[PDB]
Subunit: 265 residues, 4 copies
């Protein structure tokens, strides 16, 4: 009674070369959606598509090599891929830099990359979805959008902003079956984190599992779950939201942070 | 890749004689969970179990006739049903009464019914779940917990409170795989609403579908979805949260209100 | 130059023989308001009244000895002081007890004390203020109302419920010059907290400043301001809100917690 | 009796030749503070300065003609007025344009104007205030920051982003007596809004009070207070926060919207 009726639907997953974006893509094609994988580097895109052909040899994949952080990257894609039934705004970059040190241009970069990507894309895909009363748009933000991270003012700002953008969009869907919602993942075990855990805690013969554990206890004491979230975990929800089974959720920001944010919300 | 591994798990759904509670029960047994249906009236419980045997003739149902709004109702159940792997706190009552008119005792009733039920039950089931590091507890609140309804101060208060209770519980699960979360449904087409729509709007030859529509536009202008949420809709999520697929959501309050609450949250 | 315009107004400060309550009162009497000091024990009411005059000889006070935590204390104060222009619902009371150890009895008590006191008093006063088009009601909650205290979930729930009650009440003042708001003070240096410090960090022989210092380090790592809040600092805000000056604030929940809650709110 | 203690302090009120900005300034000069009036056009700065003295002859002002919406205006004001004890980030600017009609260009503009003005100015001033242990920075957002305006999503995003920026900044003041907070005024009677009313409800010949009256009915049905907010009413709050009196408020977002946002917040 709980089918994800998303076979035959084309989903775009921006910056899905690795991490969450990769997890989300895999899960979605696993439910027979025609996933359009986007990444800046042509190598990274192909290499990802291979990891996937390997898992679902009967699958419809499409490499969308482009830079969605650039104005010209985006316009190419609305040209080359006019129809998109499910849009996941996963593209988002970051770099830790104490606040007084963030150069000015960096604020302009993180905004163009983490927001305009979403604005630019939806300016066409949502319009299109609205005319046909059908589809999803989901933003991948982070628990930072509510609890700003101490060494990423700007990133934290971009996340917080996404929420706004997300809600304003959700309200353009009045009457239809199109939902625009945002999810907020907590600390996930991406691949940069993966190896970050190797070098961290030296001098203490530690296993990488035991390592996650002390790292959480150490730098992320408010986590109830007490471990990184595996991409798959985020992917489950994203998929759920992608399905027409989630038609009652529109204009929401759902926290998927294993407890991080101490708030009754 | 998205299985709800909840076959063999016993789920308790308080006040599941009708409405959401009924929708949630059905969906859950539909995924092979051993559902324990609770209702105050012995008739209402049986009558519900029949509608269900009818749908899943190969199903494990258990009538739990009891009043979970009473102290003695609850203690009977922890006695008679010691093991519960999934606990849905659906029981909740209400009655519209202008604020200055709510008698005092009514505030005491709505609190005992809409909160103590949850407190009392979890005081044992959560404790138990924590010792075995496994299980879910979900609270069915309402978008009222954030946007209080004008003619239900007390009900609105009870909802708002649930959020707190929910978050405090989520924090007892530190380290385990037990999640305690709350969802907030919007205006749903229960059965009291169902017929409320019949008498409403007389004098205007209207179909009941067209009726929902003007009623939303009329008394619920902030809804993006523009129609009642069908119980099934809530049930989808509840089930999702019931599954171990949702292990990254702990201590959250997810809005499932089709847009009602105008908030970037 | 910004006139507080408090002279001639009658303010009832519940549970104000000590802590934040006592400070609140002091401030209003300083500002020319007519204040009614209320506590359960006659001893404390006069003692508090003595202090206040000892500082402001031209003070306008009125002792109100009643347990506003009872249906009857409330009935009495209402029959007796019919006209109140300003109602500060300060009366509140916590106790740390692990969730599974909280007796069922205890929930109703905090309920009646931290919530019904509010309800009862406002059922009568707010009604009056509205027919009169002018007035103020302010609820003193705590940062717990948003970030629950792991040591006392019941107290936490009542604080969260104040937020709902407050907002509904506010919505009733529609079209008038009456306002209803809530403030969430963080942890403050009240004799209660003072005692608890001497009490804790045992056998280290520490002067309250040293004592306060590491309690914030160990137990309130999240505070920006990094110290206990002096009672006076909360009064400042309440006095501002009591004034006509705050006319635009209505149905808000103002955080005054020295940065405790890590939320862009 | 509650001393605002503003004499001797230097306050920079960005974009304060009009509306809320102009009111804010007035209030601080009334309170003895040294105020720097800032606008893009030299004409307006002196005109505003004339008004203020016309009311307070002993006024301490200083004209700051610069476009704080530019990298260079900011650089100039910083090089020139190095020591500022109080920074009110009031400079902001909206425009109604349907989401799909908003030019890509426009996003960067509002970004640079409503956000970088904040960032740039604080990169310099807050840094200083912290090394000095004392200071205040306040951001003037709007109710949009929580409840987005359907007419201008870009302006909405920048208001929501202020909330993040504000909270991060706050967290940097850890251990000092510097505070960073944000206020969300609702709709106010600013000449801008005044013009728009004359402009709208055409051919009905309505005096501004009648005009204001139904605009709130039709367009702000959600307001409790039911009228436009007079600029003075926002200044009151900002002045309070500017004062040392508000020492306990840190990293908060205070709603001052006459009840617009229906949220227990």
């Amino acid at each position: 009674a709980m089918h994800m009726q998303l076979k035959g639907k084309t989903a775009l997953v921006t910056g899905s070369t690795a991490g969450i974006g990769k997890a989300i893509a895999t899960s979605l094609v696993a439910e027979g959606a025609n996933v359009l994988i986007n990444g800046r580097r042509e190598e990274n895109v192909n290499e990802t598509i291979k990891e996937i052909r390997a898992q679902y040899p009967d699958a419809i994949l499409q490499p969308v090599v482009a830079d969605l952080g650039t104005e010209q990257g985006c316009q190419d894609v609305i040209e080359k891929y006019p129809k998109v039934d499910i849009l996941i705004n996963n593209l988002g970059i970051f770099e830790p830099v104490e606040y007084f040190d963030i150069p000015d241009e960096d604020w302009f970069k993180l905004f163009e990359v983490n927001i305009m990507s979403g604005v630019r894309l939806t300016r066409s895909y949502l319009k299109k979805m609205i005319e046909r009363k059908e589809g999803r748009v989901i933003f991948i933000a982070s628990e930072a959008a509510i609890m700003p991270s101490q060494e990423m003012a700007h990133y934290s700002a971009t996340k917080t902003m996404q929420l706004s953008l997300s809600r304003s969009l959700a309200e353009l869907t009045t009457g239809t079956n199109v939902t625009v919602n945002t999810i907020m993942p907590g600390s996930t075990l991406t691949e940069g984190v993966e190896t970050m855990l190797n070098s961290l805690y030296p001098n203490e013969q530690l296993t990488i599992e035991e390592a996650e554990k002390r790292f959480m206890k150490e730098n992320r004491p408010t986590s109830i779950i007490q471990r990184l979230i595996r991409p798959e975990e985020i992917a489950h929800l994203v998929t759920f939201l992608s399905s027409p089974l989630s038609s009652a959720i529109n204009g929401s920001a759902l926290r998927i942070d294993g407890g991080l944010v101490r708030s009754v919300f």
